[PDB]
């Protein structure tokens, strides 16, 4: 399948034990999907000084479209010293590894795999 339906347990930035994917845009893009397919990713909401507090290169989640079966649709951009790899819509937040860290919410999307 070319979508994926996901339920992506939403994290709170202090809370993050792992607090990024890797070191390089194709390393944290890698690992990301991996993740995402293995149910082992979670989601912070990027708000005034949540990125300072990760590791970049940062992975964002960016709405594709404007919502099958309340699944928002959503691509991978990858994000260091401020280039972006990848062109998308607005930000749901930054991906990060999850390591068993207590959810504040999910987030329903369908990642274009």
């Not at 708000?47 to 970049?56: D, R």
């Not at 990858?78 to 999910?106: D, F, K, N």
């Amino acid at each position: 399948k070319t979508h994926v339906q996901l339920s992506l347990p939403v994290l709170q930035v202090r809370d993050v034990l792992v607090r990024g994917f890797g070191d390089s845009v194709e390393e944290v893009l890698s690992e990301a999907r991996q993740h995402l397919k293995d149910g082992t990713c979670g989601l912070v909401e990027v708000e005034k000084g949540v990125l300072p507090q990760l590791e970049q290169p940062y992975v964002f989640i960016k709405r594709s479209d404007a919502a099958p079966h309340g699944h928002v649709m959503v691509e991978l951009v990858a994000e260091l010293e401020g280039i972006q790899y990848g062109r998308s819509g607005e930000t749901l937040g930054v991906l990060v590894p999850h390591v068993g860290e207590i959810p504040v919410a999910y987030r329903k999307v369908l990642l274009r795999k």
